Design a protein around this ligand. Sequence first.
Ligand SMILES: [Cu+2]
Ligand SMILES: [Cu+2]
Ligand SMILES: [Cu+2]
Ligand SMILES: [Cu+2]
Lengths: 287, 286
Amino acid sequence: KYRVRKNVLHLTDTEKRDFVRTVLILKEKGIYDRYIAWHGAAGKFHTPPGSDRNAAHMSSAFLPWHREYLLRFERDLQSINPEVTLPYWEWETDAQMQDPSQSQIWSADFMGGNGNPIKDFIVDTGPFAAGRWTTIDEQGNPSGGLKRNFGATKEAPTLPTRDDVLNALKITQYDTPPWDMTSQNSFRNQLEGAINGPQLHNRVHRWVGGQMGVVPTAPNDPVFFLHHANVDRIWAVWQIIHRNQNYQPMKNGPFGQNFRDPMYPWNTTPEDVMNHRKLGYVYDIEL
Amino acid sequence: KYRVRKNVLHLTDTEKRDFVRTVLILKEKGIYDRYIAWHGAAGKFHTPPGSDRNAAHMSSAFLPWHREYLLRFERDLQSINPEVTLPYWEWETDAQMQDPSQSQIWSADFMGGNGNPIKDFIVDTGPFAAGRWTTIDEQGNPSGGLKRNFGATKEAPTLPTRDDVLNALKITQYDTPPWDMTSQNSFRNQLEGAINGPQLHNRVHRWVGGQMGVVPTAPNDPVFFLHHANVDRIWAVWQIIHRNQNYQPMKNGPFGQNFRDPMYPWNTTPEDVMNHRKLGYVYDIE
Ligand SMILES: [Cu+2]
Ligand SMILES: [Cu+2]
Ligand SMILES: [Cu+2]
Ligand SMILES: [Cu+2]
């Protein structure tokens, strides 16, 4: 319960500065790119092979995989600066703004702003602007700078709402057979946002555009973690509320999606990460 | 010094059988694919990005990466059957055969044969023949069966010799800057076989052909692990010959390559695996 994960909006200027500084060190040290590689690597690991499901997306392990991912990332942040925890991007409240792109998350002392359409949507402002921050492609090579294009798409013009989130929280079953993009009455599939998609998680990715708009390049934007922190938070809340509903499938799902299978590229199981508090962190709204 | 790793040729018919069994169980359970994927994923992790070095090859970590690789793989074998250990293919003595394709390793009770020249060099004999063993491409999709094409290439018509190995054992330095394939007087580079390549390690791969001959697909062929078992043994010998040499670079190389850097996709450092005996295994003949 010790590590407290705060809403981006409640961060002090000092906190915002400290977080960015720590990320920039993770980048400079070679560590940040391991996260990009791990995420892409899970996308190529299909469960079972030739299925549309993979280790991190399109099936039950979507939630615990990303939880494990953020935890490792946070420990790395911590090892540079023990005062630093992983903030979350409460995007359903940004959604309530007349213009969500005016959110303070996108300020130059934080994430920086939207892309420059004269420079093919290259991010120009903030700590991660072209020149200060280099990106990698799906092959592991430099790809020339962060891009963003907020709301550009027809299918994802807006961020998910507070009501979308509340409706997902009403769902009873964690997941359902056949444990994929077609599952119904599935919290997992709901939060992930395949149900009449893109909705919720998938929608945020789409809305941001740039590298975030394409799954294998998504972690290239540091806001990927802030976004996923919000997803992980929504999930933790679902668990608090539905205390007897456990992870599914317990067994006899595809290998890698069961409660006790390891989650490639790790040996970590969904069981290992089910109780977030046990992992050493808590979300501010729990207090 | 408890788990002992044997020469393929010294295995009993039943050791061979149980090894084959255990591999097949690993495949069926989905665990084998993790090894294919880890290996391909580390091949796309360049250190630094854009360099020709990657986490697992063409730089210093090649030896400790694969040692860690086989360590985890053998543990997985063990969890199915505590009697099964990783054998090693001693390809330099096989090279002394008139026709190395007649080595017992390729018998039908073990690894199976060379590919069938009529059926696109699809392997059709042994436990891993098409219809009995599915294979996977660079992108993780099914791909239609094991292939092999022994000695079919101008660049590797033959396996490496006892003398190739003996010579590599003479190099004084584990490795040398710039910690890549151009490294001179480098043990790691010699063994990997980029010096006037393909030699040794590189050569064994090209000689086998099929999935073995292209690095991101190589672990589709179970013979990968037997080959790298031998590479690992060879490093083990060298370390004993040069007892006062250590791993390099200790701190000057790219991140991922230094003594206490983690080796993607694991947190394991080279340091963690410098002592194979500490890891819980020894090779028959030491
Ligand atoms: Cu993801
Ligand atoms: Cu995502
Ligand atoms: Cu390799
Ligand atoms: Cu190899």
